[PDB]
Amino acid sequence: AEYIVKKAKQRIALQRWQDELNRRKNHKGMIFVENTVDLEGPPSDFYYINEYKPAPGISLVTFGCSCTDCFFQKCCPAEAGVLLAYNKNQQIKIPPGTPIYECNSRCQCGPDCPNRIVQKGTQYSLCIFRTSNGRGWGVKTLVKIKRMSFVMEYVGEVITSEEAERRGQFYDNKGITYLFDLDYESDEFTVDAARYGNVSHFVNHSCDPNLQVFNVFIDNLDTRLPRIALFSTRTINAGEELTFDYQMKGSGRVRTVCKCGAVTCRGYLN
Ligand SMILES: C[S@@+](CC[C@H](N)C(=O)[O-])C[C@H]1O[C@@H](n2cnc3c(N)ncnc32)[C@H](O)[C@@H]1O
Ligand SMILES: [Zn+2]
Ligand SMILES: [Zn+2]
Ligand SMILES: [Zn+2]
Ligand SMILES: [Zn+2]
């Protein structure tokens, strides 16, 4: 009875939140919201952002390449001492731990350069949905995603690692999960998606995940401050939940029990 009224208002609240997410988003794919399991409405104190929101005094970002064919000429990755990340079908072909150096605002090439993938934004329609076995909100794809494909970036506030430590003291276990050290080549900065984030803010942990982190440099060449991209590790089917390994944010208190469901589940998130 109280329940029935709450369900009815919940439906309206989730619709209004979906509409707001779609106004805020700057990428091609749609964002959907669904809760067929319980009465949870939209989270409070969460603001959708498309890119890193740096703290006061933190600056994010120029030479580019001059290729007429960035796929076959000596291009931005070459200049940085690395391989081109991508094959002709937009799939990442370099191993985890290798940085992605995409072409940038200073390169001569246009949008359809095969070295401009992360920067084009998420192409897939995705749904924030309520999980059925106690893992809160999660994210699923509504369409099939090819192996080794760009899905979404991890974004949040960009703060110092010192700030994240201090913030973490007042965070519960969930809040700590929103801290993402940018430790590719430096211990200086941390992404905090707790309050400001994109759809990656709702992606759950798995012990056999279907997404994998890569560091990305576009206009930014300072390796203290990589952008973080999530690429698929395998073919992901329509309707499938997206997951990454929270322990693999980089290659560097109650223990939360892992409910990922994998046969090889490690039992705990932390
Ligand atoms: C970054 S949040 C992800 C979205 C979150 N499920 C929500 O409702 O907003 C991480 C938190 O989600 C839950 N979670 C994610 N993966 C889980 C898993 N495999 N098993 C149990 N809980 C999980 C835990 O509460 C964890 O602290
Ligand atoms: Zn080039
Ligand atoms: Zn370039
Ligand atoms: Zn290019
Ligand atoms: Zn697990």
Numbering used by the authors: 13 to 73, 77 to 267, 282 to 299
Question: What do the authors report?
Answer:
HKMTs catalyze the transfer of a methyl group from the co-factor S-adenosyl-L-methionine (SAM) to a substrate lysine and, with the exception of DOT1L, are all organized around a canonical SET domain. Methylation of H3K9 in humans relies mostly on members of the Suv39 family, namely EHMT1/GLP, EHMT2/G9a, SUV39H1, SUV39H2, SETDB1 and SETDB2, as well as then non-Suv39 enzymes PRDM2 and ASH1L.
Mono-, di- or tri- methylation of H3K9 constitute distinct biochemical signals and are established by distinct histone methyltransferases; G9a and GLP are mono- and di-methylases, and SUV39H2 di- and tri-methylates a mono-methylated substrate. The Post-SET domains of G9a, GLP, SUV39H2, but not PRDM2 include a ZnCys motif previously observed in the structures of Dim-5 and the H3K4 methyltransferase MLL1. Unlike I-SET, Post-SET is absent from the PRDM2 structure, which lacks co-crystallized SAM or SAH. It is partially folded in the structures of G9a and SUV39H2 in complex with SAH and SAM respectively, and fully ordered in the ternary complexes of GLP with SAH and H3K9 peptide. As previously observed with other HKMTs (for review), the co-factor contributes to the formation of a hydrophobic, mostly aromatic cluster (composed of Post-SET Y1211/Y1154/Y261, F1215/F1158, W1216/W1159/L298, F1223/F1166/T285 and SET H1170/H1113/H220 in GLP/G9a/SUV39H2) necessary for partial folding of the Post-SET domain. Surprisingly, in our structure of SUV39H2, Post-SET Lys-264 is inserted into the partially formed substrate lysine binding channel, which may represent some form of auto-inhibitory mechanism. (2) A loose conformation when SAM or SAH, but no peptide is bound, which may also accommodate non-specific sequences.
